[PDB]
Amino acid sequence: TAAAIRAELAKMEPFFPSGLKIVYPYDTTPFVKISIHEVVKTLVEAIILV
Amino acid sequence: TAAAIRAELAKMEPFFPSGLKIVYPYDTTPFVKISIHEVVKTLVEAIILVFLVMYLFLQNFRATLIPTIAVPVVLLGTFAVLAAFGFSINTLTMFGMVLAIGLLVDDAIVVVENVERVMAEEGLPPKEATRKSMGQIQGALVGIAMVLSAVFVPMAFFGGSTGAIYRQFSITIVSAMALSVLVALILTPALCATMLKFGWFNRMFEKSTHHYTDSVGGILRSTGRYLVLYLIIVVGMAYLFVRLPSSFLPDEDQGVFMTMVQLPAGATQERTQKVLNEVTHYYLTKEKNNVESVFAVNGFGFAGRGQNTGIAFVSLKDWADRPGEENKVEAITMRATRAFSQIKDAMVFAFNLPAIVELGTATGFDFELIDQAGLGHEKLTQARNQLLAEAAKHPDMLTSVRPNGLEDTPQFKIDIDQEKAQALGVSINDINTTLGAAWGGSYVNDFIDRGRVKKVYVMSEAKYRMLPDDIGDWYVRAADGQMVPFSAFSSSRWEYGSPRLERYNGLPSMEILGQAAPGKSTGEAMELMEQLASKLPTGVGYDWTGMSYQERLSGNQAPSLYAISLIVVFLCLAALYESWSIPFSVMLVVPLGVIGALLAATFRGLTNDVYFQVGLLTTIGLSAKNAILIVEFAKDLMDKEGKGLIEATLDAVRMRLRPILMTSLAFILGVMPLVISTGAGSGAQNAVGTGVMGGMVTATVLAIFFVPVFFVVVRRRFSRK
Amino acid sequence: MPNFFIDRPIFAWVIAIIIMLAGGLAILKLPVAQYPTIAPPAVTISASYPGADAKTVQDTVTQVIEQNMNGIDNLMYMSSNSDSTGTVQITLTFESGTDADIAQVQVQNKLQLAMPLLPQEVQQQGVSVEKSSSSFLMVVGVINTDGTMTQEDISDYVAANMKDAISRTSGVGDVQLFGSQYAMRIWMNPNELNKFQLTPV
Amino acid sequence: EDISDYVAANMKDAISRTSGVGDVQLFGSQYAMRIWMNPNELNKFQLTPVDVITAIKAQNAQVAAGQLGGTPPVKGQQLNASIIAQTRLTSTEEFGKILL
Amino acid sequence: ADAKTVQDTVTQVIEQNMNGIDNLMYMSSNSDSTGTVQITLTFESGTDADIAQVQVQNKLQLAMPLLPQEVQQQGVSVEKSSSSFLMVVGVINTDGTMTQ
Amino acid sequence: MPNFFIDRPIFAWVIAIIIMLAGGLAILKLPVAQYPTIAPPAVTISASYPG
């Protein structure tokens, strides 16, 4: 859904008035993206130690 | 639903006034109804030809009654499984039975066709034969089936508007093929150990067999020309494959079409009718050998009511009464349009709705042209006007760009002066109501008509509301009781406004239909449009919706799938022969079949429609199945015998003749009708039929003298050095 | 393996048969629908404002409804479009797969919130929400052989007496009417209303 | 209160009709056509917001009007078009110049 | 009210609108002389009750605009037909203080 | 079981390719997130009628 949010948000910039920025404050999506790199990595890295 | 309507009505009929019939214009129901049942006839009947081929090759009753009663068992079982799987009976799910009737005659043949030999080895033993034949065959049936699956299933794994159409073939056949093997390990073995067991007649094959068994091996020797011949036949396809254009589903003659008639905005109801008539009449007089009825309807907008559009449900005869393509909805409705667009001063036109195509292949694009900023109606018109303009300069490629009927019409303002009115002691209310009660209707409340509550509306007799000078008739009592007339607190002025406001997704939009006609690529059009859709003044965005929503979305590469199918046809094959090398023996047939099909499809006026892949996979695979049994008998008549080099291939290709020629002629002569079919549902039948029959013959012989080369070519060239 | 039934048949000669009734039964009741479903669901609110007019229909109803349309799962687009024949139609194409019952629901929650702003005349007019294909299932001809009735008389008969159940029959997603049911009609006249000192009011 | 308006009536509708996008509460408020009463100056004219409202309500409203060449027309008839009548105030000058 | 003054102000109308609703078997209706209107609607064998009551109900919601104001104030309820189940506690007073 | 496969390891090995081949596609078009659906569903009514 975040990927659609931004995808739409991309659609509504080309038409923004004279000088309007879309700062992306508070978002709990980069966290997920990471706490999946972590595990997924400790997996290869599990597989290695064994 | 149609069952119900038609019986709801039923309960009516006995009670309506005097002479009041229900006639039946445009109905789409029965075609489906006839259609899937014209296919039923095919199975039913092809179970008959298969019974006869299983005769000129066997010459017994009860020894024929056995392989022919297999398919009918398997099939019926499929219908159960289908139901299990929450699926329905319908075209896809039936052709997938038809194409599958190959895969059933064969698996039965094959078995009895083998317990037919070994009865030329054991003098007179039934149970001994059938049993012996089994085992040295049973783990072979299991494997083919465990490998044809893949020649099917990796389709119906790519979803989208489509995919779910393929999934129907896939499942139908992945099962019903499985039932084949249960019949095979249950019905066909016994029962052919129950009721199993002309000098210029019989002797035909057998004499001409050695002649085959001779012509073989001998081949590719003191002229290696044959192993080259493949690379030729191969480069053979790939050509023709890119030449043959592709399509989803072949439009059909359902026995009914409709005719638009949208005049321009602001026409009159009385004129609109004129146009309707004439259409109603053209059909009536001219194509009266076809046009059995015409339900003319005027006022009826397909994208919304209007005094300027109309519709015509035209209804044909029983097909059977209209032989040759000239009496096809396609032709009927071809000349039908040329006749109109003539003598008609309105954009009239007739067309046959594309079956199963709830948007799938409506050919072209919707390009909604949105107003992304505070723009407004006028600007936007304009901005379209431009984009529309350029559209024209690039007709270099096939195009036909255009809007929908929101063309701005003259409107007649009437601006009430709230001062003069209160100044004359008129209220605004009293005014408003009078205006738009006489000129716009108003429905006060509900009276009752013979015991059915109905509506009640106040409004001006037509004659006192027809041109701006009548707004001259209405006065309005003021608070002094003096009757005051509009032209006392008001004043009018013609101008231009819009008879439709589109919006799309919340913003004002404007629909622009358009296609890339015969020539270029539906993806160019889009591209192009997008390109000139970035000029138009600032504030104008755009978008796709509909067939074009689903273009940029739903295309889940086939080859990209069909490869995962190679890999699985291989590892399976290997799996089976235990050789990272034997299986190319068989995979290599693949081409020999689709060689026929990408021909005949080119020979007949045909496409890459579905029904082509189904009749392409049913050979691609079947072909690779008769090829297993002729590469399985080697490595065996070789690894488990006193034989080898060509001694292997020997009685192998030798034994694989009667079965091949029998199946191949069991199917083909069976798919006979399909190919040249009558007319109802033909579309579907003809395409199924030409792609198979002409891709069967082309991999029956042209493979029968051809696998053997492979096999040797294969492993001999893996023992080299 | 085969051996089993090879010696002992009549045990295979019944599988086949059971197996056959299996598809006998499963045929009596298998849905012979036309072809598989492939078309995304689509709901359409559709209001109407008596002799209102396009800009008026829409700056006064359509935007009002649209604005209120959110939190609706699986929604691909919506597309208002609405005629100056006093008449609107908003059609929302939900995703593919989506449960039509629900969307149809989802839609009417949010539209419900607009009811209270429409113009009374759009209300009383009757506002509606549906879930069907665009393209017509079938047409039903109603013809009068004696010529004992007219066009206007039929569209009546037909509305009073037959739409009613059709409109109401499962699977009948939407009935159009090729005419109109009757109504007391008060074709006024100004010169008079004028004479006697009367307004439509 | 310039941009709030932007996002609200230029971007909040699609986002909230966006995929996965459940509910969507907006920090800020769309543009209203805010008219501010003056107490003594209303008083200065013998007038309550009641009259104010009254005004607004008939000065700025849309109004269906029917059509020349109406629904069922007289045998002949050629001309057919709407009859735009009274209508909504889009600006702010008018809201200013309303007749109390 | 009374039956006509109910069958034609409300039970009709209401009923000209039960169209749209899914799996419906048949529908009867009472209009008696005490202001009451029942209008039960039995539905095919195992259709989901929760979902039929929706739409039924949901579809009432469009007739209310045409119900008369006396009725839309009392409100029309929609529910699932059971009139006799589990237990029925009774609360009496056996010392004439409290009336019905 | 063994004794087969151990005799006849291609087939074996083949089974092992498929599983991997098969799955591991389902890595390329299988959902992804932090937690699956974990909280219970809730629904909210919302009245709001002037001060």
Swiss-Prot record, chain A:
Localization (cell): Cell inner membrane
Domain of life: Bacteria
Gene disruption: observed consequences: Loss of susceptibility to contact-dependent growth inhibition (CDI); inhibiting cells still contact the target.
Transmembrane segments: 36-50
Induction or repression: Positively regulated by MarA, Rob and SoxS transcriptional regulators (at protein level).
Annotated S-S bridges: none
Family to which this protein belongs: Belongs to the resistance-nodulation-cell division (RND) (TC 2.A.6) family.
Subunit comment: Homotrimer, with large domains that extend into the periplasm, interacts with AcrA and TolC. AcrA may be required to stably link this protein and TolC. Interacts with AcrZ. Part of the AcrA-AcrB-AcrZ-TolC efflux pump.
Function: AcrA-AcrB-AcrZ-TolC is a drug efflux protein complex with broad substrate specificity that uses the proton motive force to export substrates. (Microbial infection) Involved in contact-dependent growth inhibition (CDI), acts downstream of BamA, the receptor for CDI. Its role in CDI is independent of the AcrA-AcrB-TolC efflux pump complex.
The name this protein goes by in its record: Multidrug efflux pump subunit AcrB
Organism: Escherichia coli (strain K12)
Residues of the full protein shown: 302 to 351 of 1049
From Swiss-Prot, chain D:
Induction, per UniProt: Positively regulated by MarA, Rob and SoxS transcriptional regulators (at protein level).
Superkingdom as given in the UniProt entry: Bacteria
Location of this chain's protein in the cell: Cell inner membrane
Effects seen without this gene: Loss of susceptibility to contact-dependent growth inhibition (CDI); inhibiting cells still contact the target.
Family, as annotated: Belongs to the resistance-nodulation-cell division (RND) (TC 2.A.6) family.
Assembly description: Homotrimer, with large domains that extend into the periplasm, interacts with AcrA and TolC. AcrA may be required to stably link this protein and TolC. Interacts with AcrZ. Part of the AcrA-AcrB-AcrZ-TolC efflux pump.
Function, as annotated: AcrA-AcrB-AcrZ-TolC is a drug efflux protein complex with broad substrate specificity that uses the proton motive force to export substrates.
Protein name per Swiss-Prot or TrEMBL: Multidrug efflux pump subunit AcrB
Organism from which the protein derives: Escherichia coli (strain K12)
Residues of the full protein shown: 152 to 251 of 1049
Curated annotation (Swiss-Prot), chain E:
Compartment(s): Cell inner membrane
Parts forming coiled coils: none
Induction conditions: Positively regulated by MarA, Rob and SoxS transcriptional regulators (at protein level).
Knockout-associated phenotype: Loss of susceptibility to contact-dependent growth inhibition (CDI); inhibiting cells still contact the target.
Family, as annotated: Belongs to the resistance-nodulation-cell division (RND) (TC 2.A.6) family.
Subunit text: Homotrimer, with large domains that extend into the periplasm, interacts with AcrA and TolC. AcrA may be required to stably link this protein and TolC. Interacts with AcrZ. Part of the AcrA-AcrB-AcrZ-TolC efflux pump.
Function: AcrA-AcrB-AcrZ-TolC is a drug efflux protein complex with broad substrate specificity that uses the proton motive force to export substrates. (Microbial infection) Involved in contact-dependent growth inhibition (CDI), acts downstream of BamA, the receptor for CDI. Its role in CDI is independent of the AcrA-AcrB-TolC efflux pump complex.
Protein name per Swiss-Prot or TrEMBL: Multidrug efflux pump subunit AcrB
Naturally occurring in which organism (per UniProt): Escherichia coli (strain K12)
Taxonomic lineage: Bacteria, Pseudomonadati, Pseudomonadota, Gammaproteobacteria, Enterobacterales
From-to range in the entire protein, with total length: 52 to 151 of 1049
